[PDB]
C-alpha cells in the first residue's frame, strides 16, 4: 500500500500543536500489532506503517526509554 | 423543653453595645448609626446638626443621586449654607451622653 512514505501524514485524531499522543498511540499500535503476529507466526510487515509513523514523530530518547521499560516489565501502557 | 441557662443582651450586654441597645429602645441615635432625615433647609427651617463640640463636618448630597458630596465644617452660631446648593444647616451643641 502507500509506501512511497515521505513522513507521517496529518491524522484528524491529533489535529493540534500537542502531538505527544500521536507518537505514543502509533508506538502502542506497532508493539500491539507486533505481539499479535509473533503470536500466530504471521508477518510483522503488516505492523510496518505504525513503525514508520512513531519513528517519524517520536523523540529517540522516548522510544529508547519506552523500549527499556517493555524489557524491564515497567512499561505502563497496555500491549 | 428549653431549660434556659443562656443570658440575654438585656442581662449581659455591657459598654458601648449596651449604650447603643438602650439608646435605640428610647428611639435615640447618640452613636450616629442612622442617616438623619433632612428638613426643607430654609433659614426658617435649617437642618439641625447635633455636635459634642462647636464644629462638625457636614457632607451635602445637594440632589438625590449626585455622586459628588460637598464637605464643609459647620460652626456653632448663625446657620451656614452648602457652598453648592445653599441648603442651610445649624449646629446644635450639647454635651456627650457619657
Amino acid at each position: 500500500k502507500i509506501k512511497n512514505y515521505q513522513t507521517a501524514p496529518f491524522d484528524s485524531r491529533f489535529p493540534n500543536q500537542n502531538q505527544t499522543r500521536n507518537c505514543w498511540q502509533n508506538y502502542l499500535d506497532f508493539h500491539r500489532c507486533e505481539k499479535a503476529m509473533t503470536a500466530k507466526g504471521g508477518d510483522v510487515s503488516v505492523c510496518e506503517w505504525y513503525r514508520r509513523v512513531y519513528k517519524s514523530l517520536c523523540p529517540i530518547s522516548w522510544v529508547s526509554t519506552w523500549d527499556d521499560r517493555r524489557a524491564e516489565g515497567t512499561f505502563p501502557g497496555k500491549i | 423543653a428549653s431549660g434556659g441557662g443562656v443570658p440575654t443582651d438585656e442581662e449581659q450586654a455591657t459598654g458601648l453595645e449596651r449604650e447603643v441597645m438602650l439608646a435605640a429602645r428610647k428611639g435615640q441615635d447618640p452613636y450616629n448609626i442612622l442617616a438623619p432625615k433632612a428638613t426643607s433647609g430654609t433659614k426658617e427651617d435649617p437642618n439641625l446638626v447635633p455636635s459634642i463640640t462647636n464644629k462638625r463636618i457636614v457632607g451635602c448630597i445637594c440632589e438625590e443621586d449626585n455622586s459628588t458630596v460637598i464637605w464643609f465644617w459647620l460652626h456653632k452660631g448663625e446657620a451656614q449654607r452648602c457652598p453648592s446648593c445653599g441648603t442651610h444647616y445649624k449646629l446644635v451643641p450639647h454635651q456627650l451622653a457619657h
Binding site: - | 442617616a35 463636618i57 457632607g59 440632589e63 455622586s67 458630596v69 453648592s84
Partner: protein, 514 residues
C-alpha cells in the same frame, strides 16, 4: 511610647506611613537591581557573569518593584492614609490585623534577600517556571526562600484586601451609597477583590512547586504524570489580575489629581469611571493564557484569549477619554502632581496600545519572550504605576507631613525622570521587533546601539531617583508649614488639616437623606 506607636500601631495614618517608608526603601533596592541589569547590557560582552547571577538580579528586580515597592506604596500607603479619611471613618475595620499586614512585609523581604545570598540565588524569572525552578535545575534553598517570601507577601495582601473591602462596605456615613464614594476608594475596593480571588490561586501554585521540590510530588514533573504548563496556568491565573492590581489604585489617584488640578469639583463621567474599573477587574480574570500563546495551545483557545484580551481596551478607553474630559475647560494648575498625571495619561496609553499588539496571538509568536513585552510592561509600570505613585506622593506629601515640597525642584525631578524612562524603554520596541530575547546577559552584535541608549537612559533615571531623596530632605529640612488648600469641599481628606490629628472623625460627619 515609640514602640507602642510604631511597632504596636492600630492607627490607619501611622501604618500608611510605615508602608510609604517600606515602599521607598524597596524602590531604592529595585532601582539598584535595574542599574545592574542595564550595566550588564550597556556594552556587548559579559560584565557580572553568566545568565545565573544576571537572572537572579532580573528576578529580584521584579519581585522588589512589584511586591515591595508598588503594592505597599499604592495600597498599604495611599490606601491606609486616604481611604478612611475619604469616607469620614475613624479608622479601618480591623486596625490590629491591619498592622500585621504591614509587619509581614519586612520578613517577606528578608526571605527574598536570603534567597539571593544562599547558593547561587533564584535565577528563575519572577514567574518561577519549573522545571528550571525545580529541585534539579535549582537545587538548594534559594527557590524555597523565594516561595516563602511570596507566601508572606500573599498573606499580607489577602488580610489587607479583607480589611479594605470590609472598611469600604461597612464604615461609610449611613447616608453615603457606594455611588457617593470617591473613585480612589472604588479603585482600592476593586483592587482588594482581585487580590482576594487571585493570590490564593498563586499560593496553591507555589505550594505545589514547594511539594515537587521537597516532598516528591510531581504536579509539574512529567515523570509522575505532571505538566509544567499547569504551573503556568495557576501562575498566570494570578499574574494577569496582578497587573490590574498594580494599575487600578493608579487609575484612582490619576482621577483625583486630574480633577483637583483642573479646578473641577468632580471627574467627568463618575458612573462610567466606576463601570470601567469594574469591567477591567472582571475582564482581567478571563484573559491569563495571553501569557501562554507559544506553549502549544489549540487555535480556538488562542482566538478566544486574543479577543477577550482586546475587549479590555474599551472600558480602559472610557477612563482615558474621561480624564481628557476632566481637563476640558479646567482652570489648569501646572503643579508637579499634574505633570506626573499628564505624563501618565499619554505614556500609559502607549503601553496599553503595545499590549493590544501583543494580544494578537499571531504577532505574539514573534514578539513573545522578546524586549517588545519588556517595552510594553515598563511603559505601563515604570511610566504608569510609577508616574501615578509620583503624582500622588507630590500631591499628598503636604497632607501627610504638614510641610510643602519645593515645586521647582519637583518640576526638575519630573523632567529628568521623563527623559530617563523614555530613553530607557522607547528603543526596547526596536530590540523586540528585531528579535532580542528576554533574560539575556548578552546579545548578538547588531543589538548594540539600542542597548547602549537604553542603558544610558537607565542612568538618567538614577539621577532623578537620587534627586527625589534630596527633595524630600529639603522639605523636612526647611519646614514650610501648610496654611490653605483649595477645593476641600470635594476633597474630604484635606479637611481635618495637615497633618490631620492621630484620631479623626471621633465625631462622624453629618450627611442627611433628602
Amino acid at each position: 511610647m515609640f514602640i507602642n506607636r510604631w511597632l504596636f500601631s492600630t492607627n490607619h495614618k501611622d501604618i500608611g506611613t510605615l508602608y510609604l517608608l517600606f515602599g521607598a526603601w524597596a524602590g531604592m533596592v529595585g532601582t539598584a537591581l535595574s542599574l545592574l541589569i542595564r550595566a550588564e547590557l550597556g556594552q556587548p560582552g559579559t560584565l557580572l557573569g553568566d545568565d545565573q547571577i544576571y537572572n537572579v538580579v532580573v528576578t529580584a528586580h521584579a519581585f522588589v518593584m512589584i511586591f515591595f515597592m508598588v503594592m505597599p506604596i499604592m495600597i498599604g500607603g495611599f490606601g491606609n492614609w486616604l481611604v478612611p479619611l475619604m469616607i469620614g471613618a475613624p479608622d479601618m475595620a480591623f486596625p490590629r490585623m491591619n498592622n500585621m499586614s504591614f509587619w509581614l512585609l519586612p520578613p517577606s523581604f528578608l526571605l527574598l534577600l536570603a534567597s539571593s545570598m544562599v547558593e547561587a540565588g533564584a535565577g528563575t524569572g519572577w514567574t518561577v517556571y519549573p522545571p528550571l525552578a525545580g529541585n534539579l535545575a535549582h537545587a538548594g534553598a534559594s527557590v524555597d526562600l523565594t516561595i516563602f517570601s511570596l507566601h508572606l507577601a500573599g498573606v499580607s495582601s489577602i488580610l489587607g484586601a479583607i480589611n479594605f473591602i470590609t472598611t469600604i462596605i461597612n464604615m461609610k456615613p449611613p447616608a453615603m451609597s457606594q455611588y457617593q464614594t470617591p473613585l480612589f476608594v472604588w479603585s482600592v475596593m476593586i483592587t482588594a477583590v482581585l487580590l482576594l480571588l487571585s493570590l490564593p490561586v498563586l499560593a496553591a501554585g507555589i505550594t505545589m512547586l514547594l511539594t515537587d521540590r521537597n516532598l516528591n510530588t510531581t504536579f509539574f514533573d512529567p515523570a509522575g504524570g505532571g505538566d509544567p504548563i499547569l504551573y503556568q496556568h495557576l501562575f498566570w491565573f494570578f499574574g494577569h489580575p496582578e497587573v490590574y492590581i498594580l494599575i487600578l489604585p493608579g487609575f484612582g489617584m490619576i482621577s483625583h489629581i486630574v480633577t483637583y488640578y483642573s479646578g473641577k469639583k468632580e471627574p467627568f463621567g463618575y458612573m462610567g469611571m466606576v463601570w470601567a474599573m469594574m469591567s477591567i477587574g472582571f475582564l482581567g480574570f478571563i484573559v491569563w493564557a495571553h501569557h501562554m500563546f507559544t506553549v502549544g495551545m489549540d487555535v480556538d483557545t488562542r482566538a478566544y484569549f486574543t479577543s477577550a484580551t482586546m475587549i479590555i481596551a474599551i472600558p480602559t478607553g472610557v477612563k482615558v477619554f474621561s480624564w481628557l474630559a476632566t481637563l476640558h475647560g479646567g482652570n489648569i494648575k501646572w503643579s508637579p502632581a499634574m505633570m506626573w498625571a499628564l505624563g501618565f495619561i499619554f505614556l500609559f496609553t502607549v503601553g496599553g496600545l503595545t499590549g493590544i499588539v501583543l494580544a494578537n496571538s499571531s504577532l505574539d509568536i514573534v514578539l513573545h519572550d522578546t524586549y517588545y513585552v519588556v517595552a510594553h510592561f515598563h511603559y505601563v509600570l515604570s511610566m504608569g504605576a510609577v508616574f501615578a505613585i509620583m503624582g500622588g506622593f507630590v500631591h499628598w506629601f503636604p497632607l501627610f507631613s504638614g510641610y510643602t515640597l519645593n515645586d521647582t525642584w519637583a518640576k526638575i525631578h519630573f523632567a529628568i525622570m521623563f527623559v530617563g524612562v523614555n530613553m530607557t524603554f522607547f528603543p526596547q520596541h526596536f530590540l523586540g521587533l528585531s528579535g532580542m530575547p528576554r533574560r539575556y546577559s548578552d546579545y548578538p552584535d547588531a543589538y548594540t546601539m539600542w542597548n547602549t541608549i537604553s542603558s544610558m537612559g537607565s542612568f538618567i533615571s538614577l539621577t532623578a531617583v537620587m534627586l527625589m531623596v534630596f527633595i524630600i530632605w529639603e522639605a523636612f529640612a526647611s519646614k514650610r508649614e501648610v496654611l490653605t488648600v483649595d477645593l476641600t469641599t470635594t476633597n474630604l481628606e484635606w479637611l481635618n488639616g495637615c497633618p490631620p490629628p492621630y484620631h479623626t472623625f471621633e465625631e462622624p460627619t453629618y450627611v442627611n437623606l433628602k
